[PDB]
UniProtKB/Swiss-Prot annotation, chains A, B:
The keyword Signal applies. It comes from Bacillus subtilis (strain 168). It comes from the Bacteria. The chain holds residues 48 to 250 of 250 of the full protein. Disulfide bonds: none annotated. This is Uncharacterized protein YncM. Coiled coil: none annotated.
Length: 203, 203
């Protein structure tokens, strides 16, 4: 598609039906987001064969200049922090320009889990484990990867101002390397090189 | 419900299945929205018996300190301006503290229309007619009225900072006065007095 439905950005699809996704995310060094409507998001996720859509990754906090966990699975968006709440949420999060190791489990005892390893704004290197409980995800159609500047409503599209670039590297699903396929490029440049993708958002 | 799904605010329901809604909206004199996540929205709308949900009203522009049209009917969110684009959109809109006369037509030749009469930030008094074309709305279950501070993602709820109060007065559906029923009050105080409702958002 020419446009992303809830804002601007780049999207790739990962043609795998696997259960465990891993990638190394290189966070932007700088974020320009001189608007009063959008939020930068960087995330993976999947479409279940049932139709359930999951967005799982990080959101940029303008207030704290860090990246924090982002997770939504269908209608369920209440996150449970299993570990690391005090190190990577509230006034803390993954620091700009750092690398974050991400693992996504579509279904671990009926819960969708995202584990993130990296460094926070205080220089602490550790882990934050987040879940959406009781999602009970069955088979998967495909996985996705996006970098976006999202808005609550459509008309707000023209007002979006966002400039940031990110990489998803060494993408593996069920321990197999997966090469993403370029999808939408809406005020974004998407570059794929094997199981690696760089998405540069610029509006 | 104790919480609104996409943010904070107050909600009332209008137990009418009628086709044409009218109300006089008194816009807030002041808007405090000292956050980097939410947008203030004031709107009416309906739930069709098909399940289709419509949100039809105004959004606050922090950039220009005005209220502008906001309309969405199910999956259709591309607004067509029939009249008044140059007077009440982009760097112009309904001025703070002013009164706006609103008429909503669920189905006018297959289109959902909102007509707004009021005064813009340049002191021009006029009309803006906006439509979502090809909605072809059939029977209605009920209408609604809300004043909210909405966010794109759930975790941003706690960070919302919004203080603004608005009134929907002389509410009529198919020329009959309708008394709203208080629903959710989530960091908002809702007061109903006959076919009039005041919603004071404060977080």
């Amino acid at each position: 598609a020419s446009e992303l439905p809830n804002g601007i950005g780049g999207r790739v699809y990962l043609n795998s039906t696997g259960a465990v996704f891993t990638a190394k995310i290189v966070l932007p060094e700088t974020v320009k987001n001189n608007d009063s409507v959008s939020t930068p998001y960087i995330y993976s996720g999947f479409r279940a064969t049932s139709g359930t859509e999951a967005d799982i990754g990080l959101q940029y906090s303008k207030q704290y200049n860090v990246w924090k966990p982002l997770m939504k699975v269908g209608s369920k968006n209440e996150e449970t922090y299993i570990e690391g709440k005090d190190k990577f949420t509230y006034n803390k999060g993954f620091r700009p320009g750092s690398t974050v190791q991400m693992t996504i489990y579509k279904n671990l005892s009926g819960n969708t889990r995202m584990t993130l390893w990296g460094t926070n704004n205080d220089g602490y290197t550790g882990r934050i484990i987040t879940e959406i409980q009781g999602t009970n995800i069955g088979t998967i159609s495909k996985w996705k990867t996006l970098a976006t500047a999202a808005v609550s409503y459509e008309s707000q599209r023209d007002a979006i101002k966002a400039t940031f670039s990110t990489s998803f590297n060494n993408i593996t699903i069920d321990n197999k390397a997966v090469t993403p396929v370029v999808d939408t490029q809406d005020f974004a440049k998407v570059s794929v090189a094997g199981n690696n993708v760089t998405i540069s958002v610029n509006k």
